[PDB]
Amino acid sequence: VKKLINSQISLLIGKGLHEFDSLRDPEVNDFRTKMRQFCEEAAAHRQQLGWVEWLQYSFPLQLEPNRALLVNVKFEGSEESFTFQVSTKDMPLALMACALRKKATVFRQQPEEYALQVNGRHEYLYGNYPLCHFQYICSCLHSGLTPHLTMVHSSSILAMRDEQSNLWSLEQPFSIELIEGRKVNAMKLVVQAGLFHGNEMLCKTVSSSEVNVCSEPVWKQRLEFDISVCDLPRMARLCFALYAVVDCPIAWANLMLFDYKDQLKTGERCLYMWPSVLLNPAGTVRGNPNTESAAALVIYLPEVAPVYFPALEKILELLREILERELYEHEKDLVWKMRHEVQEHFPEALARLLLVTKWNKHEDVAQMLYLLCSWPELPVLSALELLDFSFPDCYVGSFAIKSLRKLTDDELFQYLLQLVQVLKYESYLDCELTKFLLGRALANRKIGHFLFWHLRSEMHVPSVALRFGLIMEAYCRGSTHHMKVLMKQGEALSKLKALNDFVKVSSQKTTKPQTKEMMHMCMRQETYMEALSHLQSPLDPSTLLEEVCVEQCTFMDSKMKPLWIMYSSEEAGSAGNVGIIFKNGDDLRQDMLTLQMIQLMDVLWKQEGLDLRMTPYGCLPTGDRTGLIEVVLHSDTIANIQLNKSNMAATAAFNKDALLNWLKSKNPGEALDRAIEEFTLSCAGYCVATYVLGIGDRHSDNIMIRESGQLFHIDFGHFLGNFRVPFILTYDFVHVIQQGKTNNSEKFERFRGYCERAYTILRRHGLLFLHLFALMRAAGLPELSCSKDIQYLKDSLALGKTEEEALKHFRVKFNEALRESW
Numbered sequence: 127v128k129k130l131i132n133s134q135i136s137l138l139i140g141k142g143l144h145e146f147d148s149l150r151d152p153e154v155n156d157f158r159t160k161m162r163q164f165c166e167e168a169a170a171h172r173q174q175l176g177w178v179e180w181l182q183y184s185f186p187l188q189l190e191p192n193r194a195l196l197v198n199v200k201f202e203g204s205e206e207s208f209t210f211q212v213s214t215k216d217m218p219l220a221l222m223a224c225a226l227r228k229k230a231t232v233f234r235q236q237p238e239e240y241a242l243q244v245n246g247r248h249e250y251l252y253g254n255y256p257l258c259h260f261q262y263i264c265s266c267l268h269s270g271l272t273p274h275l276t277m278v279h280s281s282s283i284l285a286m287r288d289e290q291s292n293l294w295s296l297e298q299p300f301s302i303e304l305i306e307g308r309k310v311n312a313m314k315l316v317v318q319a320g321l322f323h324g325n326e327m328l329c330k331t332v333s334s335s336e337v338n339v340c341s342e343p344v345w346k347q348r349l350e351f352d353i354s355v356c357d358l359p360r361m362a363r364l365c366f367a368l369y370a371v372v373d374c375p376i377a378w379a380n381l382m383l384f385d386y387k388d389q390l391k392t393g394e395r396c397l398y399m400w401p402s403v404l405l406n407p408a409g410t411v412r413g414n415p416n417t418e419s420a421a422a423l424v425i426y427l428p429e430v431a432p433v434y435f436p437a438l439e440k441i442l443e444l445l446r447e448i449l450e451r452e453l454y455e456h457e458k459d460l461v462w463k464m465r466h467e468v469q470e471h472f473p474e475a476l477a478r479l480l481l482v483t484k485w486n487k488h489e490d491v492a493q494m495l496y497l498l499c500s501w502p503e504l505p506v507l508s509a510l511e512l513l514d515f516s517f518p519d520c521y522v523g524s525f526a527i528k529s530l531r532k533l534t535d536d537e538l539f540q541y542l543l544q545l546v547q548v549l550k551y552e553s554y555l556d557c558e559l560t561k562f563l564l565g566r567a568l569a570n571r572k573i574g575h576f577l578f579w580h581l582r583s584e585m586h587v588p589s590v591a592l593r594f595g596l597i598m599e600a601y602c603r604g605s606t607h608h609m610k611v612l613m614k615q616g617e618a619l620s621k622l623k624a625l626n627d628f629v630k631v632s633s634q635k636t637t638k639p640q641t642k643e644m645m646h647m648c649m650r651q652e653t654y655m656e657a658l659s660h661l662q663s664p665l666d667p668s669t670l671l672e673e674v675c676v677e678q679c680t681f682m683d684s685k686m687k688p689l690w691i692m693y694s695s696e697e698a699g700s701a702g703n704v705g706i707i708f709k710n711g712d713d714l715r716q717d718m719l720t721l722q723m724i725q726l727m728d729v730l731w732k733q734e735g736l737d738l739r740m741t742p743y744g745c746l747p748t749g750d751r752t753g754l755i756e757v758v759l760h761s762d763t764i765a766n767i768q769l770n771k772s773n774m775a776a777t778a779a780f781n782k783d784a785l786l787n788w789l790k791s792k793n794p795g796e797a798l799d800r801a802i803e804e805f806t807l808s809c810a811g812y813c814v815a816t817y818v819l820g821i822g823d824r825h826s827d828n829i830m831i832r833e834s835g836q837l838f839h840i841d842f843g844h845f846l847g848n849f850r851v852p853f854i855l856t857y858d859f860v861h862v863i864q865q866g867k868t869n870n871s872e873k874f875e876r877f878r879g880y881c882e883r884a885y886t887i888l889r890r891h892g893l894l895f896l897h898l899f900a901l902m903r904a905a906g907l908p909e910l911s912c913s914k915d916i917q918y919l920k921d922s923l924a925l926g927k928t929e930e931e932a933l934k935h936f937r938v939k940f941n942e943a944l945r946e947s948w
């Protein structure tokens with residue numbers, strides 16, 4: 127059985143576990159055994175949770191960031207069901223009491239024994255919360271729908287739980303011998319090498335002497351650094367770049383000077399180099415796995431006597447306000463001098479102090495750490511800053527995780543993407559961030575779900591395959607059942623890929639009707655009906671994808687011919703009618719990021735009582751240029767609606783009227799006002815989000831409207847100004863906001879206020895976006911490469927200005943956009 131599980135893990139994670147063994151690598155081996163044990167413990171803990179606690183693990187609550195309503199309720203084993211009138215303010219427990227009193231009378235005769243499942247979803251309603259605090263009840267009110275719930279007894283939830291079981295001494299200056307190489311180029315070669323702690327150089331960057339492009343080159347050269355060996359900080363990083371000149375970059379390579387056991391390295395190393403875009407401190411500290419093709423530098427770390435980094439026990443032994451809100455050498459001096467007073471009275475300025483400390487002076491680092499040990503825990507916002515690559519010190523990292531542990535699961539979920547990217551910055555395999563993410567992922571199945579996908583979607587990237595592979599393994603060891611659930615997802619994805627490859631070939635040889643029919647026959651094969659049906663959605667583990675409706679599946683006409691897959695579920699009723707789009711050929715990372723930031727905006731807006739009626743739909747890369755999009759049904763593109771076809775409801779005298787005619791036909795009589803309001807609010811949200819994020823190439827083909835009137839965006843190929851984007855007001859949106867009237871400053875100006883509120887709220891959290899994007903610089907998203915991309919956010923949010931000036935500035939941009947409206 128152990129063999130079976132091992133083989134399933136290899137299939138799931140996209141790397142055979144034998145590849146870990148073949149490395150004959152102590153660190154890998156220690157991570158696997160340590161992490162296996164940690165994960166296994168978490169599962170044992172889990173197998174004995176109370177039933178409500180188990181629910182908490184498996185179906186975490188979906189909550190929003192008097193008035194009456196109708197609800198339908200039924201019990202697990204029977205078809206019979208009752209419709210109740212309840213108040214949005216009622217607890218689930220009250221509703222459950224009605225359900226039982228109804229059962230008792232019909233069936234001729236304890237609420238706390240039950241949870242309420244949402245029909246045909248992995249979603250539950252429990253806790254002391256009024257019904258409308260639950261996302262699902264709230265959603266039902268806006269969409270108009272009746273909530274349909276099922277009474278699930280504790281012995282049934284427990285039956286589910288059961289089925290799911292498993293030193294200071296050395297004053298001589300640091301130096302290395304550069305022996306030889308083996309590589310390809312056109313001219314002379316030079317090796318440049320610098321020592322880094324994060325971004326900062328610990329001293330100047332020394333060079334080789336020009337040697338001809340010959341060989342297989344040979345140097346055998348001491349390179350002596352302008353720094354003492356005793357001063358090398360724990361996280362010292364030695365970086366190499368090899369290039370050509372008579373500037374032509376060839377390759378780069380980095381390593382930590384101390385191994386994972388705190389021991390300084392000696393003697394000879396062979397460094398398999400990574401091909402170039404000279405010095406790359408933020409690049410990984412593990413060699414290029416393609417040893418056959420990779421250029422290889424061989425160096426020699428000289429024996430300085432085994433020597434270890436001193437224990438913390440040995441470390442611990444060894445106008446200020448006016449600036450503190452980039453700083454000159456003297457200003458830096460006042461900060462270091464007043465470090466205790468910073469700890470005592472400004473513990474939130476920890477990062478500014480950490481940047482000013484001299485990381486190339488062992489004494490100063492001792493004192494800095496000493497303060498860090500007694501430092502009070504910081505708010506999450508501050509912790510998110512300390513995870514930036516500027517803070518490579520693992521006591522700082524340890525501190526930041528410590529300050530992060532107080533994240534809620536919802537918060538942790540909100541930032542999961544960024545924390546995963548920060549994994550790429552880590553100097554070693556076993557680290558606090560890994561243990562933290564794995565622990566929280568095993569304590570919450572939703573977190574586990576997305577941690578897995580964020581990792582799985584990057585397995586094709588050699589610089590991260592080993593790390594990400596090992597983490598997924600560890601997870602699997604901690605949840606066997608969930609491993610099987612994920613395989614099912616991976617089997618579905620694998621089928622879609624073959625199906626999509628067919629569609630691409632077929633679409634070049636035949637007419638769309640014929641390709642569609644052939645897609646359908648292919649889908650109707652047993653292997654395909656089996657693989658594509660009865661899974662959890664990778665977009666949302668609480669969405670069940672039951673029976674694929676082949677007849678409604680199809681594909682779109684865009685280059686990659688993405689697949690449109692429809693699903694249905696008897697047990698979920700209408701709500702189990704859901705769509706996913708499969709796309710293979712495009713990078714979805716950028717779209718995922720943009721959608722997460724828009725969803726964050728919506729969370730922040732709603733926290734100040736502003737609901738802009740946003741559509742935060744799923745988008746999830748799953749593999750190499752592969753991922754999924756959640757279909758928002760009952761929507762169409764502006765372009766399609768503006769085709770202004772005859773013989774339809776929406777037929778207008780003037781094209782400017784098409785959009786509003788369409789809304790009218792989907793919203794008869796009195797419902798039109800609300801649709802127009804829905805459209806106005808969402809328009810404001812998306813105009814602000816696109817403006818702040820620098821999303822250009824917005825046009826009628828990538829903007830969609832729902833039948834409710836809500837407006838949303840698809841296909842973000844470009845953000846942060848990369849193809850300074852103006853604020854955008856389109857005439858046809860303006861026409862709709864103005865209820866079809868030429869002049870309507872009452873409606874238009876309400877709209878302006880929506881934008882202004884939405885924008886001013888985001889500025890108050892500007893720092894949160896800045897820290898989040900800072901962390902994403904680790905993703906290697908092509909439009910999120912350097913500082914000038916972050917600057918785009920500094921400028922769009924005008925964080926330098928007071929709220930008076932920023933609102934003045936925003937007002938001009940807005941007015942400028944209105945003038946551009948014809």
Ligand SMILES: COC1=C/C(=N\c2nc3ccccc3nc2NS(=O)(=O)c2ccc(F)cc2)CC(OC)=C1
Pocket residue numbers: 682683684688707709717743745755756757758759761762827828839840841842
């Ligand atoms: C999110 O909900 C929907 C998405 C839909 N399509 C697409 N969503 C995307 C979201 C993010 C990134 C790319 C998306 N592409 C969608 N469709 S598409 O690939 O055919 C397309 C690509 C480029 C375009 F300008 C327009 C559509 C369609 C739809 O109903 C028709 C609902």
